[PDB]
Amino acid sequence: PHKSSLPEGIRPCTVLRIRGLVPPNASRFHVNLLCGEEQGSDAALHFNPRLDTSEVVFNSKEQGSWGREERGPGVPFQRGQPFEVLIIASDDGFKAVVGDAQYHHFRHRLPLARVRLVEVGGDVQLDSVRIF
Amino acid sequence: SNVPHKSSLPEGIRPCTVLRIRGLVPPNASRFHVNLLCGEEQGSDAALHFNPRLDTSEVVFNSKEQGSWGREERGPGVPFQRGQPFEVLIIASDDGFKAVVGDAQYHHFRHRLPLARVRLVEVGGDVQLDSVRIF
């Protein structure tokens, strides 16, 4: 349940560096770009590695309802293995990088200038969260 | 050692491009460089010259256009040490290049040449290169 508050939002070319360890029997974890600390706040990005189902789900949340799910190729995560993730906020969308390779491109659905908070949750052991 | 390392970038880079350079500074290194150049041709213009200097304990940013070097900028201190590995991000944005070293933003180098003119990434000097990734 890590929260990084982002007053004045994030301007494009923002890099999110997420370093951590995947627990040995972890189910799934998530990184969300939300518009506020409130519960029903809109999710500009929902990045959801799911090891139980062996997938990685991208989505957004608007007006309390989830949008269409996108999925990337395979799972660049392993139970008991560390990981580094970049989330590059561009004009065209979000570039998710895992390890040394770009994993998926999630095109914008909500205005990027609405993101007010970064939340990291789930079965993840967080080492560091940096925003450049 | 992987120097001089060259990564050719036809069709350029669009903004919000992240350059990840990882390597080791050898035990008796003097200085090394990372250049965002406009072509493989000799004496090609340098949109960015990122120049860690361990012998003089400085880090110099500059650009080169039409064969002439611009004015040098300098960052705070040297986030590099002989005998220690390093990671550097060069975030090509709309306003310029954000140089991140380790866990901290180090310096912002405003554009002097059009960002869309960069055609090559070169890494040279007293550096033992681990990887150059472009996202």
Residue numbers in the entry:
A (entry chain B): 4 to 135
B (entry chain A): 1 to 135
From the article:
pmcHuman galectins (GAL) are oligomeric β-galactosidase-binding lectins assembled from small (∼15 kDa) protomeric carbohydrate recognition domains (CRD). Among prototype galectins, galectin-7 (GAL-7) is recognized for its preferential expression profiles in normal epithelial cells. For example, while extracellular GAL-7 can trigger apoptosis of activated T cells following binding to glycoreceptors via its GBS, it can also bind E-cadherin on epithelial cells independently of its GBS. In this work, we studied the impact of homodimer interface mutations on the induction of Jurkat T cell apoptosis, allowing us to positively and negatively modulate the biological activity of GAL-7 by designing a covalent disulfide bridge (G16C) and destabilizing mutation (G16S) to control homodimer strength, stability, and biological activity.
